[PDB]
Design a protein around this ligand. Sequence first.
Ligand SMILES: [Fe+3]
Ligand SMILES: [Fe+3]
Ligand SMILES: [Mn+3]
Ligand SMILES: [Mn+3]
Lengths: 274, 274
Amino acid sequence: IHKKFKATSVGYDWNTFPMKLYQIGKRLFWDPAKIDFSKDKEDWKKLSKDEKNYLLNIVSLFMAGEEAVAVDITPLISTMINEGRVEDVIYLEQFAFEEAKHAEAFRRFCDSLEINDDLTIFTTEYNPWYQKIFYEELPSVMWKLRVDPSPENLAVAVTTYNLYVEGVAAESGYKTFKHIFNSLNIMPGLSKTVNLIATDESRHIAYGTYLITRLIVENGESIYRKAIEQFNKLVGLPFGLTPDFTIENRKQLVNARLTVIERALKMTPEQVKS
Amino acid sequence: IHKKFKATSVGYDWNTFPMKLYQIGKRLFWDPAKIDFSKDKEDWKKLSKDEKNYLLNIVSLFMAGEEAVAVDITPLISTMINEGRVEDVIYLEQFAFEEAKHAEAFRRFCDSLEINDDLTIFTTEYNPWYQKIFYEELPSVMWKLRVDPSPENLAVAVTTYNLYVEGVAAESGYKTFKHIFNSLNIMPGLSKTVNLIATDESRHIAYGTYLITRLIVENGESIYRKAIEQFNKLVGLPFGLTPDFTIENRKQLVNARLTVIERALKMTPEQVKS
Ligand SMILES: [Fe+3]
Ligand SMILES: [Fe+3]
Ligand SMILES: [Mn+3]
Ligand SMILES: [Mn+3]
C-alpha cells in the first residue's frame, strides 16, 4: 500500500536490536570466494569410506537447510512489512542474505571435493526427522504467516526456525564440526567456512531470541503457550563421536532455549523493545 | 511446500546471470560505516539555502525509494519461489540487501548532517510523480504478484521496478549527483556513497534486464506488449543544472531501456537463459 515511509518521517531506530545486529553483519562480512579449498580435497582423500559418508551426510543436512531457511524467510519478511517493522525488515532481509551465502559456501565446498552427484539420499532416507521438519513443519509454519500473520503464528514460526533449527539443530552440527576439525586436523577451508557460518548464526539466534521475546512481552500469556507447544512438538559414530554426547548437547541446547524463552516472561516491554 | 530442494539434487547453476552478479555483489561489498562523513558536514554549511534544499530533495527521493524497493521485493522473491528459480531467489534476496544497505547509507548521510526533521514534504508535495509511482504504482504492480504470479504481471512488475525506477529514475539522480559533486568539489563522503551505490545499481539493472528479457524470450508476443504498455504508463535549477538537460538524460535513459527491451525480441531462449 505504501501509505507512509518509515524512513522519510519517523526514521530508523539505530539503537534497536535488529539494527545493531545489522551493523555487525556487514562489519564481519566474509566472502566464500576468499576461502581456499585447495587442501580440503587432499584431506578428503585421506578419510575412510565411512568418515566421508558421515561428513557428506551432515554437510548435506546444512546445505539442504540453508536453502530452505532462505526461501521460508519470505513470509516472515512480508509479515514484518504488514506489521510496519521496517527495522525488522532490514535485518530479516539481511538475515536471509547470510543464509543464502551459507547455502553457497556448502555448495562451494561440495563442488571443491568433486562431489557432483545427488545428495537427496541424505536429507530424507537416512534421517526422516530432517524430512518431517524441513519438508513439512518449516514450510507449514512459515507460509502460514502468508495467510495468517497473527502473533501466535509468528511464535510458532520463529520457534520452528530460529529456536530449534538454528539454535539447537544448526548449533549441534557446529559442535559436531568442532570435534571433527579439531581432533583430526583436517578440512581447514571448511573450518574457515564453519567458523564464519557459526559467527553468522550468533546474530541469527540473537534476533530470533529478540523476536520471540518481543512476542512474550507483547502477548505473554498466549505466545508462550504456543512457543512451547511448538517447541515440544519439534523435539517429538565416526570421528570419535559418541551417540550419547551429541544427543546430550542437542538436549543441552534445547534446555538452553527453554531458559531464554521463559526468561522473557514477567519482563517489561520497555526492557527489550525500544 | 518444499517437495524438492534445488540445492541437494540438481544443484546451483553457477554460470547463470543471477549467480554471476551474486559473485560480484559479495566481491565488491562495501560497508557504509567505513565511509567517513566528517567533512560533508563542513561542506553542507558552505552551500546556499536553495542548494541545500535541492540536495536534500534528491536525497529524500532516493532514501524514500531505497526503503520502498526493499519492501516491494518480497512478492518478486515469493514469485521466484513458486517458480522454483532458486538461483533468482538467491540474487533477488541479495538484490534487496544492497537496497536496504542503500537506505541505510542515505539515512547515515542525513544523520551526519544533523538532519533530524521530517523529509515527507519532499516525497509527495514537491513532486507528485514520485507519489504516483512509489505510493500507488510500485505497490500495486509488485504486490499484484502475491495474488497473481503470472508472467505478464512479472513484466509489469520489473518494468515498474528495474527498468524505469532503477535504470532511468535512479540513474538520472546519479547523473544529477555527477554534476553536483564534480563541479563544486563538495560532499566527498556522499560521493563515495553514490559511487558505491551506483556500482550496485549496475548489477541491479543488469539482472532486471536479464529477468525482463527472459520473459520476452519465453513469452515474447504477450510480455513485450505489457512491458511496453507499463513503460509507456510510467513516463505518462541550482548547482549549474539545466532543466532541459536532466530531462534529456531521463529521456535518453528511457530510450536506453526501449533498445534493450526490443533487443530481447527474436532472440533464442538458449542465448540468454541457461
Ligand atoms: Fe541462521
Ligand atoms: Fe537497485
Ligand atoms: Mn545458517
Ligand atoms: Mn538502489
